[PDB]
Homo-oligomer: A and B are copies of this chain.
Amino acid sequence: SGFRKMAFPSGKVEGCMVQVTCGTTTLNGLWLDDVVYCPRHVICTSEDMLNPNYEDLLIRKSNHNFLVQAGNVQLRVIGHSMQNCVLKLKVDTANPKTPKYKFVRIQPGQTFSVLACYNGSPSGVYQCAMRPNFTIKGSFLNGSCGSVGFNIDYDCVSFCYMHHMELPTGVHAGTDLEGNFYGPFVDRQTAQAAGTDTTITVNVLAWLYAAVINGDRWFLNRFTTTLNDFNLVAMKYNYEPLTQDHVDILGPLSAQTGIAVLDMCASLKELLQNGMNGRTILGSALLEDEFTPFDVVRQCSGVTF
């Protein structure tokens, strides 16, 4: 037992990190097969950032303007192309340490592991949720751009995130591995608000199931609720609406604990309307919303990779 914010083992990703330099900008790239992926703003000067024409700027670059290093090994760039906001550098060597992988685009409320890197070297690993406003609450310093987020599925690393920038609120934004930003953002140095952040209701419910599985049960009650009446209360507290698809994904946890999803919703309703009265759940005084139902199942059932 116990319940922790747990990341995927990062070994299969550490072997893909390289350092990409263009001009005086050094950041991280992802070296899969014979392509290195990195944020396209590696080609910009700080003056270019206010309003860059990336098409024009990349045309003025040549292959030898890109210095890619895998440790000490100097990779020779033989081609460069732009896919949305990511740059694809073709190199003369396939990365042997290339795992089985796919590129996936996660949905708001889904979680992933971030391998934070600097100068192509891993610094640490942590777990993040894609917020409903398509930011992430990461931990990133200058030099971290090109760090990636990922899940492991059996043997196959699904890459879902590449880090590009930080908002004035301290939260972070980036793309999927085809180069499309999550959220409304563009890679230009202008004011760009993220939406209202909301609480990921299905994840709070998942974590309440995790608490029950670990013997923390004081919040269970005799009350029940319809899904609609739950959402009327939840939306007042800036919680995301709970859908029937969400109810379905909570099914395994409902089955394992014997507590119907709408019964647990009635627990959450009372916690929202009455607070926790100075009590804690799984050691927290606030409700936690960065565990998905699948996260709870994997951690409470011991899935390996």
Contacts and interface: CB of A to CB of B under 8 A. Distances in A.
A246 interface: no
A138 B283 CA distance: 12
A3 B302 contact: no
B138 A4 contact: yes
Contact of A138 (B2, B128, B139, B172): B2
A4 B286 contact: no
A112 to B, nearest CB: 13
A79 interface: no
A7 B9 contact: no
A303 interface: yes
A123 to B, nearest CB: 5
A294 interface: no
Given A11-B11, A14-B11, A15-B11, A126 B303 contact: no
A122 B1 contact: no
A216 to B, nearest CB: 9
A274 to B, nearest CB: 14
Nearest to A170: B1
Contacts of A299: 124, 139
A170 B215 contact: yes
A283 B284 CA distance: 11
11 contacts: A1-B141, A1-B166, A2-B166, A5-B126, A11-B15, A119-B304, A121-B304, A123-B303, A123-B305, A141-B302, A285-B286
